[model samples]
Target chain A: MSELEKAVVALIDVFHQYSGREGDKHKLKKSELKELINNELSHFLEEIKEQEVVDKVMETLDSDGDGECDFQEFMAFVAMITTACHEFF
Target chain B: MSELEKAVVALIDVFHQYSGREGDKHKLKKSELKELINNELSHFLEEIKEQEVVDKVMETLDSDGDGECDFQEFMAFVAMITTACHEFFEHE
Candidate 1:
């Protein structure tokens, strides 16, 4: 596969790696999301050590207020984080 | 770095791989976008052999109506294609 396709597939793979750990098997609950950040985003997790902070972020990511993060919502989070790290204006 | 971080960086790097070849260097002109799609998305390109079809796709992706596609717009496109391939009930 091409790098671009591999990247997209990696995105999906990473999501399932975490999402499969908990309740829905296809969605991320609060603890699953927190673990994902801790393992995948150590720098971001560095500041957000407090569980309360992670709770609030889960709230933000759960845009539909479902308390679970489906792939679409997770994709939105990825886009936001990637855009923040992006340099070009 | 984590695989997740690596993947995100890969997305940005892949964009520049093509976008850097021509005008603006940060944004993708039509020709640059076409070449990127052809090279990276050979399966999709295989189906969209017509030049006009590619032009129409470029127009659709350029949501801001700008002739070129910026990073933000490109991210939107990525999200869209990813979501389309996603198999969640909410995806419907």
Candidate 2:
């Protein structure tokens, strides 16, 4: 796979690696989201230091308001962060 | 960087690598977009066999009505393809 192809697959795989660890394997519960941010995205995202922040994040990203972040929601977050990072450097 | 972090950076780098080649280093002209898809995303996106396909792809992704695709637009395309790939694997 090309580097870009690998990157796309890697993003999807990373989401599953964390989201599959707990409840409803298809969705990311708040804790899984927190873990993903701290561990995988600490470089791009600020480590998600507080629970309240995670809660706020879920609220912002939970567009369908199902309380759990499905892959579509997670992808949106990735897109947002990737865009910000792109503009930053 | 973590694998995910690396991936994010790779996506950004790939865009700049091409976007830097021609006019307005920040945006991808239609030809650049076609090359990026054919060379980078061909694994997931079929070899972009024709100019018509590239044109159509740009039309769908050019949300800002700009003639070229910015990184934001490219990321949306990536997000969409990745999501579709996930769904395909989930059911298979």
Candidate 3:
């Protein structure tokens, strides 16, 4: 596969790696999101070390107010961070 | 770096590979975006063969009416496709 295709697949793989760990097999609860960030995103973002941080991250990511982060929501989060890092404007 | 980090880097790298080809080095004209989709997403998406298809894609991807696709816009497009492929409900 192409590099971009591989990347897209990796994004999905990483999400499922955590999402399948807890209650929902597809959605990510706060703890799953937190662990994913602290592990996978440690290079780009600060570690989620606080309960309030977890709450805020989940609330922001849970755009539908569904109390968990879905694939679409997680993708949005990825876009936001990637855009912020792009910063080429 | 993690696989996710490498993937994110690849995403940015692929965008610039086309975006830097012509006008506005940081944005993608329709041709550039079309080339990207055809070359990079051939496994997941249909090849762009029509002018109207290009128009529709650029119009949809250029959410800000800028006539070009920015990184943010491209990322949103990726998100939409990836989510469609996900096809998983947000429930257990």
State candidate 1's DockQ: 0.61
Residues B1-92 of candidate 2 have per-residue lDDT tens digits of: 99998998898999988898889899998889888988887677787778899889889999999889988888888888887778878721
Q: Model 2: which residue pairs collide?
A: none
**Candidates' DockQ values?**
0.61, 0.74, 0.71
Tell me the spans in candidate 1 whose CA falls farther than 4 Å from its real position.
Answer: A43-47, B44-48, B88-92
**lDDT tens readout by residue for model 3, B1-92:** 88988888888889999999999998999999999999999998899999999999999899899899998889988888777666653433
Tens-place lDDT per residue, model 2, A36-57, is 8899887777878789999999
Between prediction 1 and prediction 2, the one with superior lDDT is 2
What's the CA error at residue B1 for candidate 1, in Å? Answer: 1.2
Number of the top lDDT candidate? 3
Best-matching candidate per DockQ: 2
Query: Each prediction's interface RMSD?
Result: 2.1, 1.8, 1.6
How well does candidate 2 match the true structure in TM-score terms?
A: 0.93
The runs of at least 3 residues in candidate 3 whose Cα sits more than 4 Å from the true structure, single-residue gaps closed, are: B88-92
Calculate each model's fnat, 2 decimals. 0.62, 0.86, 0.78
